[PDB]
Amino acid sequence: CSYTVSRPVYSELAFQQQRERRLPERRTLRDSLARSCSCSRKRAFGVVKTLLPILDWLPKYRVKEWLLSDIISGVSTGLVGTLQGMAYALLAAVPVQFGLYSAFFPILTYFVFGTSRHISVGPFPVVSLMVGSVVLSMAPDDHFLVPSGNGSALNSTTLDTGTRDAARVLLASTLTLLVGIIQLVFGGLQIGFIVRYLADPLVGGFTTAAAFQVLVSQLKIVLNVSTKNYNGILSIIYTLIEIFQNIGDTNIADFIAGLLTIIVCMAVKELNDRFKHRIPVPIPIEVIVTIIATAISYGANLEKNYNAGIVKSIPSGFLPPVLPSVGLFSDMLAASFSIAVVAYAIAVSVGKVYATKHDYVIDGNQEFIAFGISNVFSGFFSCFVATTALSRTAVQESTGGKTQVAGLISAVIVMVAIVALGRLLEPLQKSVLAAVVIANLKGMFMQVCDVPRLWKQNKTDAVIWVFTCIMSIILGLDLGLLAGLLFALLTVVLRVQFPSWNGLGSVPSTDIYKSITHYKNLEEPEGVKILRFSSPIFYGNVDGFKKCINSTVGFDAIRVYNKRLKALRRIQKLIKKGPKVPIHSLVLDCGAVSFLDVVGVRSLRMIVKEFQRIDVNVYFALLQDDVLEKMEQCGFFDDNIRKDRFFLTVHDAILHLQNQVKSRE
Amino acid sequence: CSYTVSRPVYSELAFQQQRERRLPERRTLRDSLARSCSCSRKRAFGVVKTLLPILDWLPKYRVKEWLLSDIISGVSTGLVGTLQGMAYALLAAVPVQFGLYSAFFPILTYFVFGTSRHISVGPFPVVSLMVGSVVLSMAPDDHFLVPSGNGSALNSTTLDTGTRDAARVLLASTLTLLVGIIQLVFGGLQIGFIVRYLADPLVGGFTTAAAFQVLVSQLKIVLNVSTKNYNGILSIIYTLIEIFQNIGDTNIADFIAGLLTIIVCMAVKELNDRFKHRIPVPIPIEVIVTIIATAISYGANLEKNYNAGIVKSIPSGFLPPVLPSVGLFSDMLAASFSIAVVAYAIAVSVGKVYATKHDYVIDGNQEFIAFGISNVFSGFFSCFVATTALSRTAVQESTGGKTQVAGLISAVIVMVAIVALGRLLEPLQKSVLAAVVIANLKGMFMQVCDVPRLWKQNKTDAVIWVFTCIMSIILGLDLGLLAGLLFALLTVVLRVQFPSWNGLGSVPSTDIYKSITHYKNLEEPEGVKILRFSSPIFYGNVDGFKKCINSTVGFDAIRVYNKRLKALRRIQKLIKKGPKVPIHSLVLDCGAVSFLDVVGVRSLRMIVKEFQRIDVNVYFALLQDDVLEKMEQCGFFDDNIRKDRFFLTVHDAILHLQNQVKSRE
């Protein structure tokens, strides 16, 4: 209808007199810590239900059809997960059966502490790549070349296949234990705001660069070339150059097989993704391609006749738990922190996606605790860091997944594999397992197509994507994340250091104030100049505010007073012998401020004092209550700078100025 | 008088229809660079006048009366400068004769390019500490112990007094040029916002902890003990213990003489500063205490009889310019960046203090060019980084200083010293020069008295002060600055990640909205709940906004919709066999937002979408123009989320709801 008001001009004190405030809540530290710690059985039951969410979804089961859905999803996800684990085991520089280990214990551990229903905990290409990189950095190949074998001229320093795998597995287990400890520390301390800094473009660029490096590593594995595990600055460029220089030492059979299975898997995946209306259940192309590869590789002796590369080192059994080799935390702390934070970010992303898909709640700290306990339990059985693969997670979602029982059934497949299924997988070529990893990289490789879309959107967020992707390629992958978080924080600081100030004016016959750089037909008060300044004043944008004021008033408050003094000395000597014209007042519409940064309130008081010498009043329009209460403690309201200078709304200041001009000429 | 308005409820589109906007300015990249590069003589005359400000104050000089005030201040600061200049030379591990060079060449260069009038360019105790810090690390004492002197058992690896200074002086000369080049880079590229991050508490806590390290460094010379130049983590802590372990190797002749001049110089300094009404010109106690010290040290043979420490190595002459030893920039790149930024910080700090005293403007970017060429010209004559000592600067201002000519006369006093005055200073004890530095540390030691004052003020700024002081002590002095800059910028991110949200309500019979946690007698609309959120939404505080909205409404928009489906399944099965109570609408008073961070608008659109399922409208109150124009490019105004949802003022959103409920029950 109509918007009409009728009230006197309450600037700061005409509203503060008759209005009674609320007394602040008493701290009472003793009572605060006492009331925080509860003793009733209700809080205990609540924290027990929250810490172990397994007792929640179990009593309300729907076994009738849920059992069949869970068993089919379990067998499907078990096949997919054992394949992905035996594939990713190469990325961690560990034997292939440790991938089956890491596909068994984390699933069991994420059953009594998890809080999700559509998450398949297991390996991940990015995490496996980071683990392999830090293992190669902390345990290179040229550190175990034992001289033996009666060489031609010098000592026969051949490869140390064998005992070196034990050292690599011990290093990976120590890394996993440290990652789990870091996750449990982050969870128990209730600190969850530390992972909010990994923005969507940042994690997107990080996953893109990690997928590119995974493609490089898998191409190195498929081509069957011997590199020098270059790490550090430009590691990916160095290893790509080394691959391009070692093209002659390739294997035609392995390369042809890898290219063929890549083409087949990609074509079948695209066909299944496109024609979803006719086939709801995704065809397990991984399973059939692995079966046919094992069949072909076993019939014809590809190992002997074609000199192919097979595993032929599967022990096909369990092992007793081994205590982790404590003592290498100082040289892997940052790597473990990076691995933990990226794993938790990917886990939270997948959880939120598959939760908003099925409309259920997922707690962050509980997921952190669950993944921490999972990594800790994995460290005691020679496993690497566990996460949720988006490809494997989609399997249980498409085939039908209701509870974690489908995941528990998925562990039964890996269970029967570790003991029995895998002795027949002996003649399987390593290039076959190295191919499905590349085929699963389609999701992260298509993420590059959003950069043109982000450019039409906020450009600062698009630069962060490119900055993260490039920095996570030049200066390694683990250090690239730290270069991305700091760059994002710097971009946030820059957006508040250079605000968007305007020339706010008055709309005729109304009281709403709009910017002058956006609207044309606006009337500003005669002599009065209004200024709006977002991005609250801190120690960095103080000079920015000075420049903004000097630009919006046309002159400089310092130079005007300097010229006044230079003209005054001629006045004081002539009697012995014998700029600030248009501006009348300044209204600062500081309504978009949150903090004040007293280092900045000092400069604000300096500005107000300097404008007093040139007889130009500087008022305030829409300062908040929490801002004025903070400025009061900062020593700003002296005997000269009273509260009448501040106002409540922008139009009240203009009305007061007009009334003062009318009553005082 | 009265504040009354009468206008219809223009929410977003009722105001946008009849209001014509201004067309944005055409970029025209071709014409932009052409219009920027001017060719007229007025623009050419301006850039030359600003680059060389000497042609400004020289033609309008007042030689009649100004020369008298400069000739008395030049001989005054000249004697103070030649003593403080050689005293700070000990902090740079260079001979005492090179300290006189740093008081002659930088003054001459700050005459044709300087832009100030009350600044005495010269050495500085804090800057000289950072210079000598990298000299000890890149050229330690145990790197030149030549075995010679027919020792007792092993090779006589005695001290290398003599050619050892050439290794440190040449290293200091390379540091001076590299610092000067960095200052020219920031000046040439016109980038001056990088020094705005050095806040007052940051530079205050830095100089406080640096002065504490100067006390430890100068006490080493007073006690005449031999340390092991410990550098790195806990550098000051390690060298302090080594001093306490080497108390037995003291010198009572230097200790008594050193402690005596400490009390004398401090007493007269406090006496003259207090009794300013009777004596306007500060008594040069530093000058008289040195002349009387040389007389006593020359009369009685303190060197031979008392085994004191004298210089006795002053060549008293000039030297041809030597080319800098290029090739050590890689090991001094990170160090020079820290020294270059603190030299300019103290320059503007001391500069702006005396600028508002005489009311003259000082160009910030010109100081980078001024000190830039100063250090470059200083590097060609074996000098260290030049700055402005607050103690020496106060001398030329109190004794009477109008222009840089007073500094030019002060250079003549140092000029006659390099040739003649200084051969008589041979028997001067090094403890005397090492004690006058400690006496001037009173100004930086009394800076600790502001921490209780800052605690009553904004506490976050007080923590940065303590954080900078401690970090600049544990992990060195140069690395402590970087730890303070990152911590200060992080505090800005923390202040915007955890905003100050309130429960804004309506004041009766008015239209101004105040917070509910500050005022008592406020009436909120029936069913409507208003929420204000400062610190604009970015990728970090977006999760906090969800908890903020869930806290102000009492419920969770996600759990309520999940409980609806939990109850809907019973409804769809009973027909086959046979929370959100108070909240009516949500008004988000996002009037304190500056940026939008499209990464966050994806969740912002999700918020409006989530509350739509529970039949709870979420409106907007005071969104700015530059923010709504940004959300449009982010893909937010779809066929369902129109512009009618947004409003101009907070009361228009409330008035519209009252009219909508009255017209639609």
Side-chain angles (χ1 to χ4, degrees), chain A residues 1-25 28-29 31-34 36-40 42 44-573 575-665, chain B residues 1-25 28-29 31-34 36-40 42 44-573 575-665:
Chain A
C1 62
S2 182
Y3 171 76
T4 167
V5 303
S6 298
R7 61 175 179 89
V9 186
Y10 302 151
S11 60
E12 180 61 27
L13 70 160
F15 182 78
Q16 200 66 31
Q17 291 179 359
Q18 68 283 353
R19 221 67 59 180
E20 52 276 357
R21 303 184 69 260
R22 298 180 61 91
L23 63 156
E25 56 278 354
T28 323
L29 220 292
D31 182 70
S32 73
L33 61 89
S36 300
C37 180
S38 300
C39 194
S40 61
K42 180 59 78 282
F45 175 79
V47 300
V48 165
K49 185 67 62 179
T50 304
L51 185 60
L52 288 79
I54 180 184
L55 301 180
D56 190 10
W57 51 270
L58 183 60
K60 56 169 178 291
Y61 218 84
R62 291 183 175 90
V63 193
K64 181 59 181 300
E65 68 284 347
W66 281 10
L67 188 143
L68 180 60
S69 66
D70 288 328
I71 193 78
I72 187 263
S73 298
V75 294
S76 180
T77 50
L79 297 180
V80 175
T82 187
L83 293 185
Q84 291 184 4
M86 70 186 303
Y88 296 154
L90 302 181
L91 284 174
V94 298
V96 74
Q97 106 274 16
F98 294 97
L100 282 73
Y101 292 159
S102 180
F104 175 76
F105 300 97
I107 298 186
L108 297 186
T109 316
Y110 192 72
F111 190 81
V112 296
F113 293 110
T115 178
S116 180
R117 300 179 181 90
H118 296 170
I119 290 184
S120 62
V121 52
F124 198 85
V126 177
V127 184
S128 300
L129 173 68
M130 297 185 65
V131 170
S133 180
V134 303
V135 164
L136 289 174
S137 68
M138 206 56 60
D141 194 12
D142 57 355
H143 194 271
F144 300 95
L145 63 170
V146 44
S148 294
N150 57 267
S152 60
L154 73 161
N155 299 270
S156 181
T157 60
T158 59
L159 191 55
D160 199 8
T161 300
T163 60
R164 133 182 175 268
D165 93 314
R168 292 186 175 273
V169 165
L170 263 57
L171 186 60
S173 61
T174 54
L175 176 75
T176 312
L177 179 75
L178 189 52
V179 169
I181 291 180
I182 292 181
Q183 292 184 0
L184 290 183
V185 166
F186 281 162
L189 296 180
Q190 210 67 20
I191 166 180
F193 60 93
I194 189 180
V195 310
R196 304 178 182 179
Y197 298 152
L198 284 76
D200 192 11
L202 206 161
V203 68
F206 182 82
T207 50
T208 298
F212 204 94
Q213 295 182 1
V214 162
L215 172 61
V216 171
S217 300
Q218 297 297 271
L219 181 60
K220 171 187 59 60
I221 295 181
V222 166
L223 292 179
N224 192 90
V225 299
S226 60
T227 55
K228 207 179 300 300
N229 54 89
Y230 290 149
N231 197 331
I233 308 300
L234 295 176
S235 60
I236 171 180
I237 302 300
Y238 289 160
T239 188
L240 184 61
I241 293 300
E242 190 174 13
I243 290 175
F244 287 160
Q245 293 180 0
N246 296 21
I247 298 296
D249 301 329
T250 183
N251 194 328
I252 48 180
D254 298 332
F255 172 78
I256 287 180
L259 181 60
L260 180 60
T261 183
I262 279 290
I263 293 180
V264 169
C265 186
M266 183 59 60
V268 176
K269 181 62 62 180
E270 182 68 23
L271 183 64
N272 182 267
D273 192 11
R274 181 173 63 259
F275 291 160
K276 190 63 62 179
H277 61 269
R278 62 178 184 92
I279 303 297
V281 43
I283 168 71
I285 173 64
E286 276 68 276
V287 181
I288 180 61
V289 77
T290 303
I291 290 179
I292 192 60
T294 53
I296 295 300
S297 180
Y298 180 77
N301 197 331
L302 268 56
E303 170 66 23
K304 181 180 62 60
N305 301 330
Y306 295 158
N307 197 20
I310 67 180
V311 180
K312 72 179 180 180
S313 180
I314 306 182
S316 68
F318 283 87
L319 79 169
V322 184
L323 287 314
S325 180
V326 57
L328 303 180
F329 297 156
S330 60
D331 39 323
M332 297 189 303
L333 199 278
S336 299
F337 168 79
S338 300
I339 292 180
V341 65
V342 300
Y344 182 73
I346 298 175
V348 169
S349 180
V350 175
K352 291 302 179 180
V353 168
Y354 289 83
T356 192
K357 175 259 174 180
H358 199 270
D359 300 0
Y360 60 93
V361 189
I362 289 185
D363 199 334
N365 301 121
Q366 185 60 29
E367 284 288 343
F368 221 155
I369 293 296
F371 275 95
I373 298 180
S374 300
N375 297 332
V376 166
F377 190 86
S378 309
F380 294 156
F381 292 91
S382 300
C383 306
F384 48 84
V385 185
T387 332
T388 159
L390 180 59
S391 61
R392 178 175 56 257
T393 307
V395 180
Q396 61 180 186
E397 176 267 355
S398 54
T399 57
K402 307 301 296 180
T403 55
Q404 292 292 151
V405 182
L408 179 61
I409 295 176
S410 176
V412 185
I413 300 300
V414 187
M415 175 60 180
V416 77
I418 294 180
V419 48
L421 181 60
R423 182 58 182 269
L424 189 141
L425 302 180
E426 183 268 347
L428 176 57
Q429 289 182 141
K430 299 178 59 180
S431 300
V432 180
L433 301 179
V436 294
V437 187
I438 298 180
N440 294 132
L441 292 180
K442 178 58 65 62
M444 289 183 292
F445 281 159
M446 291 293 100
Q447 298 180 0
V448 193
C449 300
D450 82 326
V451 185
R453 181 58 59 91
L454 294 181
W455 194 269
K456 300 180 61 179
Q457 299 178 354
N458 178 269
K459 301 180 181 300
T460 63
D461 299 324
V463 180
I464 298 180
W465 198 101
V466 184
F467 194 94
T468 303
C469 180
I470 295 180
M471 244 45 62
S472 46
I473 282 180
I474 297 181
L475 44 146
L477 186 62
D478 49 72
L479 249 299
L481 177 73
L482 181 60
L485 299 176
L486 295 180
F487 182 81
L489 297 181
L490 181 60
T491 307
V492 172
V493 172
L494 288 180
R495 289 198 296 264
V496 306
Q497 184 181 2
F498 301 93
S500 60
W501 53 271
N502 296 325
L504 269 286
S506 180
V507 182
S509 180
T510 40
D511 62 331
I512 173 63
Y513 290 88
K514 313 299 294 180
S515 174
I516 197 59
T517 60
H518 295 353
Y519 299 88
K520 181 182 301 300
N521 295 20
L522 297 181
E523 50 176 11
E524 57 181 0
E526 204 282 81
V528 187
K529 189 62 176 299
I530 311 179
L531 174 64
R532 185 178 183 90
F533 194 87
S534 303
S535 300
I537 315 169
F538 58 100
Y539 63 93
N541 64 336
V542 38
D543 303 330
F545 195 21
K546 286 285 300 180
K547 184 178 301 300
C548 169
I549 294 180
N550 295 14
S551 300
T552 191
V553 307
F555 59 91
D556 196 333
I558 296 297
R559 295 196 298 265
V560 169
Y561 191 75
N562 298 339
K563 296 302 179 181
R564 277 294 183 177
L565 291 188
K566 187 179 300 300
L568 183 60
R569 51 92 181 181
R570 278 298 306 178
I571 302 300
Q572 64 180 0
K573 67 181 300 180
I575 55 180
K576 183 179 60 60
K577 178 182 178 60
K580 56 181 181 180
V581 180
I583 298 300
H584 185 204
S585 298
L586 181 65
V587 179
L588 298 182
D589 193 6
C590 300
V593 294
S594 61
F595 54 89
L596 230 287
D597 191 4
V598 54
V599 196
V601 88
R602 297 180 180 180
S603 180
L604 223 179
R605 182 175 60 91
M606 180 60 60
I607 292 174
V608 176
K609 210 66 177 182
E610 289 172 357
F611 272 87
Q612 185 67 21
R613 301 180 301 181
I614 60 180
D615 195 5
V616 175
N617 301 20
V618 174
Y619 296 160
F620 299 86
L622 227 179
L623 270 299
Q624 295 80 359
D625 306 355
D626 196 14
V627 177
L628 298 178
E629 292 291 339
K630 195 64 174 180
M631 292 177 58
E632 181 180 0
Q633 301 179 0
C634 296
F636 183 83
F637 301 90
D638 60 78
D639 199 13
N640 180 268
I641 306 179
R642 299 180 300 270
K643 292 183 178 300
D644 208 339
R645 192 166 304 274
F646 294 80
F647 295 84
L648 287 184
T649 65
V650 186
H651 196 196
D652 286 1
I654 303 300
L655 233 301
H656 175 63
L657 274 169
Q658 293 180 181
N659 296 324
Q660 184 178 3
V661 170
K662 181 180 180 300
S663 180
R664 196 271 299 270
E665 301 292 337
Chain B
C1 62
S2 182
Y3 170 74
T4 168
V5 301
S6 298
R7 60 175 178 89
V9 186
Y10 301 151
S11 60
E12 180 62 25
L13 70 160
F15 183 79
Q16 199 64 48
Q17 291 179 0
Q18 69 283 352
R19 220 68 59 181
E20 55 277 356
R21 302 183 68 259
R22 299 179 61 92
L23 63 157
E25 57 278 354
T28 322
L29 220 291
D31 184 70
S32 66
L33 49 87
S36 300
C37 180
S38 300
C39 196
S40 60
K42 180 58 76 281
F45 175 79
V47 295
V48 175
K49 182 64 62 179
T50 307
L51 184 60
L52 289 79
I54 179 184
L55 301 180
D56 190 10
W57 50 270
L58 181 60
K60 60 170 181 293
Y61 211 83
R62 288 181 172 89
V63 198
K64 177 60 183 300
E65 62 275 2
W66 279 2
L67 188 142
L68 182 60
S69 60
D70 296 331
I71 190 62
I72 187 262
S73 299
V75 300
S76 180
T77 58
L79 298 180
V80 182
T82 188
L83 297 179
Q84 295 182 358
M86 66 189 302
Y88 298 153
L90 300 180
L91 288 174
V94 298
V96 90
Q97 133 264 347
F98 291 99
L100 284 76
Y101 295 155
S102 180
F104 174 76
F105 297 96
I107 295 188
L108 297 183
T109 313
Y110 196 76
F111 189 82
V112 296
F113 294 109
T115 177
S116 180
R117 299 179 180 90
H118 297 167
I119 291 184
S120 61
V121 50
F124 199 88
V126 175
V127 183
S128 300
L129 180 60
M130 301 183 62
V131 170
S133 180
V134 305
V135 174
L136 296 176
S137 63
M138 208 57 58
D141 194 12
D142 57 355
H143 193 271
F144 303 94
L145 62 170
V146 44
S148 294
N150 57 267
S152 60
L154 73 160
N155 299 270
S156 181
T157 60
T158 58
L159 191 56
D160 199 7
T161 302
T163 61
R164 169 178 165 266
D165 74 330
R168 301 183 179 274
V169 170
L170 269 61
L171 180 60
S173 62
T174 57
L175 179 66
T176 313
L177 178 66
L178 187 53
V179 168
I181 293 180
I182 295 181
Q183 297 180 359
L184 292 179
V185 170
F186 294 156
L189 299 180
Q190 210 67 21
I191 165 180
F193 59 91
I194 188 179
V195 307
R196 303 178 182 179
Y197 298 152
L198 282 73
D200 192 11
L202 211 164
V203 71
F206 180 82
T207 56
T208 295
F212 201 93
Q213 297 184 0
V214 173
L215 175 59
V216 181
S217 300
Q218 290 294 273
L219 186 60
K220 175 184 58 60
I221 307 179
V222 176
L223 299 181
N224 192 89
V225 299
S226 60
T227 58
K228 207 178 300 300
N229 54 89
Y230 291 149
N231 197 332
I233 307 300
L234 297 177
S235 60
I236 176 181
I237 302 300
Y238 289 160
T239 187
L240 181 60
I241 302 300
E242 189 176 10
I243 289 180
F244 292 156
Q245 294 180 359
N246 295 21
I247 297 297
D249 302 329
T250 181
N251 194 332
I252 57 180
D254 299 330
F255 178 80
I256 297 180
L259 183 60
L260 180 60
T261 175
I262 283 293
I263 304 179
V264 174
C265 186
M266 181 63 62
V268 184
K269 181 62 62 180
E270 182 68 22
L271 180 63
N272 178 271
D273 193 11
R274 180 174 64 259
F275 293 158
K276 191 63 62 180
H277 61 269
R278 61 178 184 92
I279 304 297
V281 42
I283 167 71
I285 176 62
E286 289 80 48
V287 178
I288 185 60
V289 76
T290 304
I291 302 180
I292 193 60
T294 58
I296 300 300
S297 181
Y298 180 78
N301 197 330
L302 268 55
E303 169 65 22
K304 182 180 62 60
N305 302 330
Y306 295 158
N307 197 20
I310 67 179
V311 177
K312 72 180 180 180
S313 180
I314 299 180
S316 68
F318 285 90
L319 78 168
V322 184
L323 287 314
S325 180
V326 60
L328 302 180
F329 297 155
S330 60
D331 40 318
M332 299 188 303
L333 196 275
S336 301
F337 177 80
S338 300
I339 304 180
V341 65
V342 298
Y344 180 81
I346 304 177
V348 183
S349 180
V350 182
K352 291 301 180 180
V353 167
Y354 297 91
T356 180
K357 174 257 178 180
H358 196 268
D359 299 2
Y360 62 96
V361 188
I362 293 183
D363 199 333
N365 299 120
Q366 187 65 24
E367 294 286 353
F368 258 142
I369 304 299
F371 283 97
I373 308 179
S374 300
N375 300 331
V376 169
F377 188 85
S378 303
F380 294 155
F381 295 93
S382 300
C383 305
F384 49 86
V385 184
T387 333
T388 159
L390 181 59
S391 61
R392 179 172 57 258
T393 306
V395 182
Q396 64 178 187
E397 177 267 354
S398 53
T399 57
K402 310 301 296 182
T403 56
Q404 295 292 151
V405 182
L408 181 60
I409 301 179
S410 179
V412 184
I413 304 300
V414 188
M415 174 59 180
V416 77
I418 304 180
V419 45
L421 181 60
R423 183 59 182 269
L424 189 142
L425 301 181
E426 182 267 346
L428 174 58
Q429 290 182 140
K430 299 180 60 180
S431 300
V432 181
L433 299 178
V436 299
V437 182
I438 305 180
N440 297 127
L441 299 181
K442 179 61 64 61
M444 290 183 293
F445 282 159
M446 291 293 100
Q447 297 180 0
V448 194
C449 300
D450 82 325
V451 186
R453 182 58 60 91
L454 293 181
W455 193 270
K456 301 179 61 180
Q457 299 178 356
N458 179 269
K459 300 180 181 299
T460 63
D461 299 326
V463 180
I464 298 179
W465 198 100
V466 184
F467 194 94
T468 304
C469 179
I470 296 181
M471 243 46 61
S472 50
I473 282 180
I474 298 180
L475 45 146
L477 187 61
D478 50 72
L479 247 299
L481 177 68
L482 181 60
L485 295 176
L486 297 180
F487 183 82
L489 294 177
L490 182 60
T491 312
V492 184
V493 184
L494 295 182
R495 288 195 297 261
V496 301
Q497 186 181 3
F498 302 92
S500 61
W501 54 273
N502 294 324
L504 270 284
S506 180
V507 182
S509 180
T510 42
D511 61 331
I512 173 63
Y513 292 87
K514 312 300 294 180
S515 175
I516 197 60
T517 60
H518 296 352
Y519 299 87
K520 181 182 301 300
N521 295 20
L522 298 182
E523 48 176 14
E524 57 181 359
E526 205 285 81
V528 191
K529 190 61 176 298
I530 311 179
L531 173 64
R532 184 179 183 90
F533 198 88
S534 302
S535 300
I537 316 169
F538 56 97
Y539 59 89
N541 68 334
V542 55
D543 299 330
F545 196 21
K546 296 294 299 180
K547 186 180 300 300
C548 174
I549 300 180
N550 296 12
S551 300
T552 182
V553 305
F555 64 94
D556 195 333
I558 292 297
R559 296 195 299 265
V560 167
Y561 182 80
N562 297 331
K563 292 302 179 181
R564 278 294 183 177
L565 300 181
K566 187 179 299 300
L568 186 59
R569 53 95 181 182
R570 280 297 304 177
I571 301 300
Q572 64 181 0
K573 69 180 300 180
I575 56 180
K576 183 180 60 60
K577 178 182 179 60
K580 45 175 177 174
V581 182
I583 297 299
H584 186 202
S585 299
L586 179 63
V587 179
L588 297 181
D589 193 6
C590 300
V593 292
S594 63
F595 55 88
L596 218 281
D597 194 5
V598 58
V599 195
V601 83
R602 301 180 180 180
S603 180
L604 215 171
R605 183 176 58 91
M606 183 61 60
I607 293 178
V608 187
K609 210 65 177 181
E610 287 172 356
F611 281 86
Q612 185 66 23
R613 301 178 302 182
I614 61 180
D615 194 5
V616 174
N617 301 20
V618 175
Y619 296 160
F620 297 85
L622 227 179
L623 267 298
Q624 295 80 358
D625 304 357
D626 199 13
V627 182
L628 296 179
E629 294 290 340
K630 194 64 175 180
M631 299 180 61
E632 181 180 0
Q633 301 179 1
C634 299
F636 184 83
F637 300 89
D638 58 77
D639 198 14
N640 180 268
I641 306 179
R642 299 179 300 270
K643 292 183 178 300
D644 209 339
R645 193 166 304 274
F646 296 82
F647 294 83
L648 286 184
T649 64
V650 189
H651 196 197
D652 288 0
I654 301 301
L655 227 298
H656 177 58
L657 282 167
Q658 297 181 181
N659 299 327
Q660 183 179 1
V661 176
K662 182 180 180 300
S663 180
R664 193 270 301 269
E665 300 292 338

